[PDB]
Amino acid sequence: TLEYNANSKLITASDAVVALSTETNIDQINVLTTSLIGETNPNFTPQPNEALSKMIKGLFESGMKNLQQKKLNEALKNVSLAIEMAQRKRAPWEAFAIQLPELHFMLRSKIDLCLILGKHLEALQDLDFLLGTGLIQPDVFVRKADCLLKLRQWEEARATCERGLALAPEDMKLRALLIETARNLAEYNG
C-alpha cells in the first residue's frame, strides 16, 4: 500500500516492509512532484535553471577560495555541499549533457582536495564512480593507482595501471607507478 500526505503532497508507503525497487520508485516520484511544484510553467522545457546554477557556482567559488587561503578542511565541506545541492535541488528534466559536465568538473576538484587532505577511501569511491559514468582519462588512473597503493591493494592497482598504460603509454608517471607496484608486489609475495 501507500499513503498520500495532504499538505506536503509526498507519497509514502505505509506498509510494514517495502521492496527496494518500489522504494526507489516512490522516491523518484516524490522528487518529480517536488520539482513540478516549484516549476510553474505547465509545458516545462529541458532547458536547465539559471538561479540554481548561479548558487552552485557561488558555492563552488567560495569553496575554491579556501585553497588560496590554504584551508583544506572547510573547502571540502563547501564543495561537498555544492555537489549535494546540485544533486538535490536540480530538476531531473534538465539537460543531461549540461548537468553531467558540471558534476564532473566539481567532482574532479573534490577528488583532488580529498586526496590532498588524506581521505583515501572516499577518493577511491569517487574516482570509480567518475570512471564508470563515462569519463576515461589518464589523469584518473594515476590517482586511482596512487590511492590503491595508499590503502594496500596491489592487484587492483597493477590492473588499473596496466589499463592506463594501455591507453596513453607515453606517460612518465604511470611508468613510475607501475615500477613501484611491481616492487611492492614482489615484496608482498617474495
Partner: protein, 138 residues
C-alpha cells in the same frame, strides 16, 4: 518489478481521495522513463541474447519470451503515450524528450546515490580500520 502498476494504483487513489493533479503527471513521467530505459536495454541486449541462443546455451522458450517482451514494451509505451495525450492535450512532442532526459538523469542519480552503500562493503571485504576523518590507522 516495475512502476507501471504504481501509476494505476495512484490513479485509483486519485479517483477516490481527490489527491493533487501533479502526482499523476509525475507517475506518468516515471513510467515513461522506465519504459524508455527498458526499450534501450532490450535494444542493446538483443545481439548478445541472439548470440547466446545461436550458441545453444539459453534454451528454446526464453528466446520467444524475449521477442514477445520486445513488442510488449512497445505496446506499453504506446499506451503510456496515449494516456499522456489524454491527460494533457498537445503534450506528446515534448513528453518524449522529457522522458528521454529524465531517464538518464534518474539513472545517474541512482548510480551516485549507490556510493554511500558501496563505501562500506569494500571496508567489510578488505578489513580496513578507518577511524574518524576517513584516515587509516592500520
Amino acid at each position: 518489478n516495475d512502476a507501471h502498476d504504481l501509476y494505476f494504483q495512484i490513479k485509483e487513489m486519485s479517483e477516490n481521495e481527490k489527491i493533487h493533479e501533479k502526482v499523476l503527471k509525475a507517475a506518468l513521467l516515471n513510467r515513461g522513463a522506465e519504459s524508455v530505459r527498458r526499450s534501450l536495454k532490450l535494444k542493446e541486449l538483443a545481439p548478445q541474447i541472439n548470440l547466446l541462443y545461436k550458441n545453444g546455451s539459453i534454451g528454446e522458450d526464453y528466446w520467444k519470451r524475449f521477442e514477445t517482451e520486445v513488442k510488449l514494451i512497445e505496446l506499453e509505451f504506446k499506451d503510456t503515450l496515449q494516456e499522456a495525450e489524454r491527460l494533457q492535450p498537445g503534450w506528446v512532442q515534448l513528453f518524449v524528450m522529457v522522458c528521454k532526459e529524465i531517464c538518464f538523469n534518474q539513472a545517474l542519480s541512482r548510480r551516485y546515490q549507490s556510493i554511500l552503500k558501496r563505501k562500506e562493503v569494500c571496508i567489510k571485504e578488505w578489513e580496513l580500520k578507518i577511524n574518524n576523518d576517513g584516515r587509516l590507522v592500520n
